[PDB]
Amino acid sequence: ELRVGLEESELWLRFKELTNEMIVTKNGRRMFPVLKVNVSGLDPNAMYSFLLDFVAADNHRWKYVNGEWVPGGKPEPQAPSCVYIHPDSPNFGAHWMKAPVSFSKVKLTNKLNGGGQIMLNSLHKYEPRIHIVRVRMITSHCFPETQFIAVTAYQNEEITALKIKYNPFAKAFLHHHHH
Numbered sequence: 108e109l110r111v112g113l114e115e116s117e118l119w120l121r122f123k124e125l126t127n128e129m130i131v132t133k134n135g136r137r138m139f140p141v142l143k144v145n146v147s148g149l150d151p152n153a154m155y156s157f158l159l160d161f162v163a164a165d166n167h168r169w170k171y172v173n174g175e176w177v178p179g180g181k182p183e184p185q186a187p188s189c190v191y192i193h194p195d196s197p198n199f200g201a202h203w204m205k206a207p208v209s210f211s212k213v214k215l216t217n218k219l220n221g222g223g224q225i226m227l228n229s230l231h232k233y234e235p236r237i238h239i240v241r242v243r244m245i246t247s248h249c250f251p252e253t254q255f256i257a258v259t260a261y262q263n264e265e266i267t268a269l270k271i272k273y274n275p276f277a278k279a280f281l282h283h284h285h286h
């Protein structure tokens with residue numbers, strides 16, 4: 108029985124509860140927390156490739172006013188992002204099931220989608236989606252705890268405090284809306 112579990116799901120929930128945010132830049136930024144999954148139930152001798160893309164969690168824009176996230180805008184549907192190929196692809200099912208599969212090197216951008224860079228629209232809520240392709244029978248896997256709003260700068264200052272607390276790299280690289 109094919110099973111895909113989320114690694115460090117409780118840490119993801121700390122950001123999930125406050126509505127997670129991820130920075131997008133012209134050159135791209137790594138995610139925090141990193142997406143890692145545990146896979147069981149593959150054919151260990153078959154060949155598989157692991158793919159990652161980001162789907163719209165909803166079809167409207169978002170704003171952060173008065174210390175809370177508010178929907179808005181005429182809902183225009185957003186197409187999924189480009190796919191990022193896990194660098195170990197293709198590989199045996201035994202390779203994917205021996206250790207957590209990590210997508211730590213993916214970089215989210217708002218400009219250039221080539222290679223390890225994924226282009227996202229600012230102020231939209233995205234959800235990572237993992238594709239396992241037998242080397243084409245495809246299975247797709249997502250986790251609501253990993254949803255986030257792509258932003259060019261951190262809106263919720265509580266998120267900034269969480270990122271600084273748990274991401275060791277946040278400290279090395281370390282206006283409000285009202286009406």
Ligand SMILES: *[C@H](CC(=O)Nc1cc2c(Nc3ccc(F)c(Cl)c3)ncnc2cc1O[C@H]1CCOC1)CN(C)C
Binds near residue numbers: 188190239245
């Ligand atoms: C983004 C580039 C991109 O993703 N290109 C691309 C994707 C692709 C896929 N994608 C895919 C989508 C959903 C899904 F569930 C799975 Cl398992 C896979 N699958 C197969 N081959 C692909 C090729 C590909 O590209 C190469 C082919 C054409 O150019 C290079 C572009 N955005 C506009 C979406």
Ligand SMILES: [Zn+2]
Binds near residue numbers: 234249250251
């Ligand atoms: Zn989902």
